Amino acid sequence: RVQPVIVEPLAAGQGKAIKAIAGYSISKWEASSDAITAKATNAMSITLPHELSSEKNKELKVGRVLLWLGLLPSVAGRIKACVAEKQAQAEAAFQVALAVADSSKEVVAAMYTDAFRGATLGDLLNLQIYLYASEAVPAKAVVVHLEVEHVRPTFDDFFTPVYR
Amino acid sequence: RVQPVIVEPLAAGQGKAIKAIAGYSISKWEASSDAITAKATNAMSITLPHELSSEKNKELKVGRVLLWLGLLPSVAGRIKACVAEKQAQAEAAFQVALAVADSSKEVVAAMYTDAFRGATLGDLLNLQIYLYASEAVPAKAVVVHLEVEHVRPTFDDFFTPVYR
Amino acid sequence: RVQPVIVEPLAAGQGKAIKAIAGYSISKWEASSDAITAKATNAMSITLPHELSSEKNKELKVGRVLLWLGLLPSVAGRIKACVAEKQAQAEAAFQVALAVADSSKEVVAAMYTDAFRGATLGDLLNLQIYLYASEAVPAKAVVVHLEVEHVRPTFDDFFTPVYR
Amino acid sequence: KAIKAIAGYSISKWEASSDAITAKATNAMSITLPHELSSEKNKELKVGRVLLWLGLLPSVAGRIKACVAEKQAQAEAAFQVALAVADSSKEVVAAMYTDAFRGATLGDLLNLQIYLYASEAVPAKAVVVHLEVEHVRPTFDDFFTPVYR
Amino acid sequence: RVQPVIVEPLAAGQGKAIKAIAGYSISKWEASSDAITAKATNAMSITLPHELSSEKNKELKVGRVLLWLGLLPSVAGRIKACVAEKQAQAEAAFQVALAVADSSKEVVAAMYTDAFRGATLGDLLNLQIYLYASEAVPAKAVVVHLEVEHVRPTFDDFFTPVYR
Amino acid sequence: RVQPVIVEPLAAGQGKAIKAIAGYSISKWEASSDAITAKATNAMSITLPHELSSEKNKELKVGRVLLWLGLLPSVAGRIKACVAEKQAQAEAAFQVALAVADSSKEVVAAMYTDAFRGATLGDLLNLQIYLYASEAVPAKAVVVHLEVEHVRPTFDDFFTPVYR
Amino acid sequence: KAIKAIAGYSISKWEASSDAITAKATNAMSITLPHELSSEKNKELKVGRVLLWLGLLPSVAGRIKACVAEKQAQAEAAFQVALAVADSSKEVVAAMYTDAFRGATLGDLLNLQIYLYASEAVPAKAVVVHLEVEHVRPTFDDFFTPVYR
């Protein structure tokens, strides 16, 4: 018996939008990038957010690491990005990257399941974010957003003492 | 009666893991390519890692195998790749090979279920992987990540006779 | 209630790969082809494999006849093939062919269900394999593989007598 | 009533046309598989009983004898170690090895080489060897290669 | 009442395996020594294998560790070896180290139960092994086989997201 | 309660003498060696016994590999031996050897549990037996006996046919 | 389907390369054991059926025949008492003794001597004898010699 089916087209932004695995809070931050030179890779250091720079939470156990590239509309051809370990060989970073984003898929995003759980959160500093562009991109014209969950810093809920 | 249905799109790396069937164990490694001229094929001789150089483990049963090549982003055009027996004429292998990775198709991973089950690694020592470039490409601009899996050698869970 | 669904992209060569209907063994063989001339049909005789040329098995009842064309990577534009009855009109062979292969579908293969069961196996000799190419193809640059099941030649399992 | 193929096994047969032969000297020949089981998953199959029964051009004179063995040193003395000598003089030309190889892999057959011998020289292509070998049937061979090439 | 008893002697390599406690997994490797002068100690900086270079697995818990050096037979006299924290004065480490391999004693294997349980491999990156030669010895005449073990990284039993 | 015990001294050759694990027949053979030069290693090829040279039994699954060196009484100082993989570096063969024999232990023997099960028996050919001697040893003055079990060649129990 | 080894027994096989042979005269040869069962505990084992099937250099002309017997007097007449004559002329070269020796010790085989014969002389090493003998398996051979040498 051949069951029929209709495919509802999706308006943008509709969707399940995933969910954090239990007990892990999410946190998210920006990474603006330098202007690139044409068909040349770059490797921004993934500087950690200031409010998580405390030594108290650099022990945290990173989980899923969603990444989603963001574009100025004016940018033209293909643009690519991926997190990777600190290669002295920039292009080669794509070669062993677990997953890679692309502008051309009309779903520019990437997700790193099983890539980092449960590497310690302060050790993300060793990582870098690599970018590639097919044509000249003016400064700030591309911004890599990224989101990562981790065990909730429940010990951040207290007030600073004084005045107690 | 019709069934309504609504198609989520999923990010790179989001896909369900292809679990190894139980009791087996993975062995990943990668092979660099060299030179690769114009529209002409070349042979890479798949070489085993030092942890499999041991003579016990070379005669473990092979299970499923997977091959995905990693394109360097700057490389233009489509390059295809196959796993094959040492054919005399390198082109002919694409006429016989069970599968072929395609740079152009959205997924770039040839997998060989069934085609290799039960093979000795003493056969896999005597086997080649072919590259076909549609254009001239810079040396070591392409490296092929493959993994085979085999019943785990048992010395992984023991020390050694401390007396020696 | 609109049930959601994710579409796993397939890596090449993954798949159910069909199955022979019970009691029929499969057999498979090659058919290399002559160099074509541009936009001209050709009609290779489907010479039967040598190990099935025995008069004992030319009575066998052919079933499904899978066909899958194989290519040298260098070949450019569209290429087509189909089995057909012995026309003196070569192009017209496509006109009544039950099914036809094409390079452009990114799934170049063809299958002849209900096309031959249960025509007698030796009478496949009357058939021919027609080919068409949009541009010049150098010799041996295309090879039509084909697979066909049939009742198992169970009487081929014996040894030759002497020495009994 | 040919001897039954062992259950769970399946015979394969092939010729291998002879290299030209000189008198007295035992010109060698190498066994090679049909292209169909060159592939390694097939190279790992397990051998059953094996036999050869060379067929000749009717005009052939004198005698010829053919024996399997691993290649070694001088390569004319292979007969002395050879398990059985197929021959023309005997009422039955054939030679059988129902022992010899049981439990061997097909992948080891590549190392052994049939040896031919003749008294006076015989013209090439006037003699053929017809190996027939029994082996466990490959697991894949019951169905189609997947359509998604 | 006395108990009679009769002492079998046992061959090299005959001894009962020291099994890793469950769920953990071994990682063996070896470190060459260089030069090693007269009756003076030297430091070897224990370096990790490429399969542990990955940032997930470096923060796995360490369990028990084992060190047995392999004397080249031609070497004369006794050489001792230890595992120790980067002491300023190399000799002083033999004054603090929990154990020491002895060339002269019949067994040549120092093992550290308890002394290392719970260590991060990010600590073991920053740790040294000392050699003490009683005589002048030729370069690379001594290599130290050690293995540490750690809860198995889980990527050993999965492929990779084939889509990428 | 401190239980007393007497230690019976053993006359030579008394003892349990081990036992083959079930279903595996033992086989044993000689390996005579060339005259050595003083404090120089040698590496005899481990030529397999003639009666096991048949292709039928080179598939066999080696188990335990007992080795026991045998001496002419006149030989003086320390003598050593070990099986090993085919190094181009002779002395280094001791460095990774799983176990090693020595004349000085007054129990000169060695045993390779977990060293080869279940490496295929014909592939022992790749191995070599390394020897070392502290002083000049005249030819044939040392002979390495070795014993190894394997699945019984039950198909060797038949007679040769003719006369059937 | 080779004839089954009797249960509780185990075959042993060996060649014994021939001494040089002269025409008409029957040059003798002595049977000798493989070095492996020279040892006396093995010399006391009990024989089963025994057979020989000499293999020849293919170039050998004429005929040759080989027969077992106890050594005696003139030593050329050994054939007349010999139980069966292995020969080249016969369709099967082999000779069998499924009776002959059952219940004999291996230690008595040392006394008997295979006799070779030829018409015209044959060059040495051009003929080999392949004794195959069945005997009860030694009790020790299932395990390691004790480590404490």
Side-chain angles (χ1 to χ4, degrees), chain G residues 33-44:
Chain G
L33 272 69
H35 301 163
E36 63 181 345
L37 270 67
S38 296
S39 180
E40 300 306 320
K41 190 179 76 68
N42 293 336
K43 287 289 181 66
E44 288 301 319

Side-chain angles (χ1 to χ4, degrees), chain D residues 98, chain F residues 157-161 163-164, chain G residues 1-6 49 96 98 102 134:
Chain D
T98 57
Chain F
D157 65 3
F158 289 175
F159 272 152
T160 302
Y163 184 73
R164 292 198 293 272
Chain G
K1 294 302 290 183
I3 185 167
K4 186 68 181 294
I6 298 172
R49 63 180 62 83
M96 180 73 74
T98 57
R102 292 190 184 179
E134 182 172 358

Side-chain angles (χ1 to χ4, degrees), chain A residues 3-8 10 15-16 18 39 78 80 91 94-96 99-100 105 107 109-111 113 132, chain B residues 1-14 17 68 70-74 106 141-143 145:
Chain A
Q3 179 177 356
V5 60
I6 180 61
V7 176
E8 299 299 325
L10 284 72
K16 191 187 299 175
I18 312 299
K39 289 187 297 299
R78 179 173 62 259
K80 292 174 68 69
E91 298 85 354
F94 299 102
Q95 299 300 327
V96 70
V100 60
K105 302 296 176 61
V107 58
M111 184 171 176
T113 59
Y132 166 77
Chain B
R1 180 176 181 171
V2 61
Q3 183 177 358
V5 58
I6 179 167
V7 176
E8 291 296 319
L10 259 53
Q14 176 64 262
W68 53 270
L71 289 172
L72 189 145
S74 295
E106 180 63 15
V142 62
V143 295
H145 284 83

Side-chain angles (χ1 to χ4, degrees), chain D residues 43-106:
Chain D
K43 287 289 181 66
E44 288 301 319
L45 292 173
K46 183 176 295 300
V47 182
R49 63 180 62 83
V50 61
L51 72 319
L52 65 82
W53 57 280
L54 42 70
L56 277 69
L57 185 67
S59 66
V60 171
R63 72 172 64 199
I64 51 101
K65 68 182 69 178
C67 297
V68 301
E70 300 82 0
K71 60 179 179 295
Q72 79 292 7
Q74 296 179 337
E76 76 283 3
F79 300 94
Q80 298 182 340
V81 64
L83 273 69
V85 54
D87 186 356
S88 62
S89 296
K90 301 181 186 297
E91 178 183 2
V92 292
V93 290
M96 180 73 74
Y97 306 127
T98 57
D99 178 66
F101 297 165
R102 292 190 184 179
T105 300
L106 290 173

Side-chain angles (χ1 to χ4, degrees), chain G:
Chain G
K1 294 302 290 183
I3 185 167
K4 186 68 181 294
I6 298 172
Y9 288 80
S10 178
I11 178 173
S12 68
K13 297 183 297 296
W14 68 88
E15 64 183 342
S17 177
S18 174
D19 194 5
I21 188 64
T22 305
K24 267 67 181 181
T26 59
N27 284 335
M29 180 176 173
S30 177
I31 306 302
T32 55
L33 272 69
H35 301 163
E36 63 181 345
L37 270 67
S38 296
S39 180
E40 300 306 320
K41 190 179 76 68
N42 293 336
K43 287 289 181 66
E44 288 301 319
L45 292 173
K46 183 176 295 300
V47 182
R49 63 180 62 83
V50 61
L51 72 319
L52 65 82
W53 57 280
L54 42 70
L56 277 69
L57 185 67
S59 66
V60 171
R63 72 172 64 199
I64 51 101
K65 68 182 69 178
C67 297
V68 301
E70 300 82 0
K71 60 179 179 295
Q72 79 292 7
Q74 296 179 337
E76 76 283 3
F79 300 94
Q80 298 182 340
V81 64
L83 273 69
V85 54
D87 186 356
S88 62
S89 296
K90 301 181 186 297
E91 178 183 2
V92 292
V93 290
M96 180 73 74
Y97 306 127
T98 57
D99 178 66
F101 297 165
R102 292 190 184 179
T105 300
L106 290 173
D108 295 346
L109 296 180
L110 294 175
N111 197 340
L112 56 81
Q113 300 180 339
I114 58 172
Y115 286 87
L116 288 172
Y117 174 80
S119 297
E120 69 281 4
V122 175
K125 190 64 182 295
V127 54
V128 299
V129 297
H130 291 170
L131 293 171
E132 294 176 348
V133 59
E134 182 172 358
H135 60 284
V136 293
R137 69 171 64 199
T139 186
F140 74 95
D141 190 66
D142 193 6
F143 52 82
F144 300 90
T145 61
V147 293
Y148 187 80
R149 186 189 66 81

Side-chain angles (χ1 to χ4, degrees), chain B residues 135-149:
Chain B
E135 297 88 358
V137 171
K140 193 183 296 295
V142 62
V143 295
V144 290
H145 284 83
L146 57 76
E147 78 283 9
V148 299
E149 72 278 4

Side-chain angles (χ1 to χ4, degrees), chain C residues 74-135:
Chain C
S74 66
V75 302
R78 179 173 62 259
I79 293 174
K80 292 174 68 69
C82 54
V83 298
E85 294 79 354
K86 185 182 172 63
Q87 298 301 101
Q89 293 298 319
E91 298 85 354
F94 299 102
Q95 299 300 327
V96 70
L98 276 67
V100 60
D102 182 2
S103 178
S104 296
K105 302 296 176 61
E106 194 70 14
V107 58
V108 53
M111 184 171 176
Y112 287 84
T113 59
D114 298 344
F116 294 100
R117 58 174 292 177
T120 300
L121 173 64
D123 282 342
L124 296 182
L125 291 171
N126 289 334
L127 263 65
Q128 296 175 338
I129 53 174
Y130 293 86
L131 273 65
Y132 166 77
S134 294
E135 74 285 6

